[PDB]
Amino acid sequence: SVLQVLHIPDERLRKVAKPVEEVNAEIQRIVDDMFETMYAEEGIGLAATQVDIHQRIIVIDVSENRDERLVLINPELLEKSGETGIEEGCLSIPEQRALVPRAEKVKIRALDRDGKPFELEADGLLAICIQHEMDHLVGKLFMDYLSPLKQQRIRQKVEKLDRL
Numbered sequence: 779s780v781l782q783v784l785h786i787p788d789e790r791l792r793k794v795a796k797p798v799e800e801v802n803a804e805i806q807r808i809v810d811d812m813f814e815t816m817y818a819e820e821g822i823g824l825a826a827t828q829v830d831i832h833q834r835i836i837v838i839d840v841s842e843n844r845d846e847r848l849v850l851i852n853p854e855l856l857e858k859s860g861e862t863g864i865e866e867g868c869l870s871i872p873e874q875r876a877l878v879p880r881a882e883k884v885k886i887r888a889l890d891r892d893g894k895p896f897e898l899e900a901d902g903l904l905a906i907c908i909q910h911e912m913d914h915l916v917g918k919l920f921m922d923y924l925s926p927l928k929q930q931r932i933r934q935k936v937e938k939l940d941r942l
């Protein structure tokens with residue numbers, strides 16, 4: 779259940795995810811496929827948008843052993859504070875890294891894999907991860923934070939690679 783991960787310039791990466799209607803068996807099977815897809819490569823997070831599923835679903839696992847499954851369905855940002863920035867790589871942006879500004883601390887409301895509501899306060903990489911994947915669900919990639927010139931450099935470099 780390693781799903782095809784979309785790579786730029788793909789237009790489908792800029793689509794906005796719908797709210798999940800009900801967390802039923804079908805949603806959980808998407809969730810479970812997202813984990814396996816995420817686990818097949820380096821990475822700590824994945825938004826449904828990235829596998830062409832346009833529903834507000836995010837999976838995260840930051841553990842070394844890949845045994846700490848976090849599920850965010852219909853996430854809502856409640857609060858944020860501070861600023862930070864790391865060189866983010868994105869599965870959907872082949873072989874590019876770039877620093878992007880983020881809140882340092884976030885608080886979010888979401889539904890878990892059972893459809894049960896919860897709240898989560900995050901900082902460090904987890905805060906960054908969460909915002910990065912929530913960006914994906916509104917068709918926003920980390921490159922959008924960069925200058926038009928740098929954005930065009932990334933786009934040139936990929937038209938070179940996807941060609942070969």
Ligand SMILES: CC(C)C[C@@H](C(=O)N[C@H](C(=O)N(C)C)C(C)(C)C)[C@H](O)C(=O)NO
Nearest residue numbers: 820821822823824866867868869906907910
């Ligand atoms: C930037 C990360 C919060 C999310 C991405 C991610 O894990 N990349 C790594 C990363 O840059 N660090 C800082 C861990 C990676 C490039 C090292 C795999 C993820 O692969 C994605 O694109 N999810 O939509």
Ligand code: NI
Nearest residue numbers: 867868869870
């Ligand atoms: Ni990404």
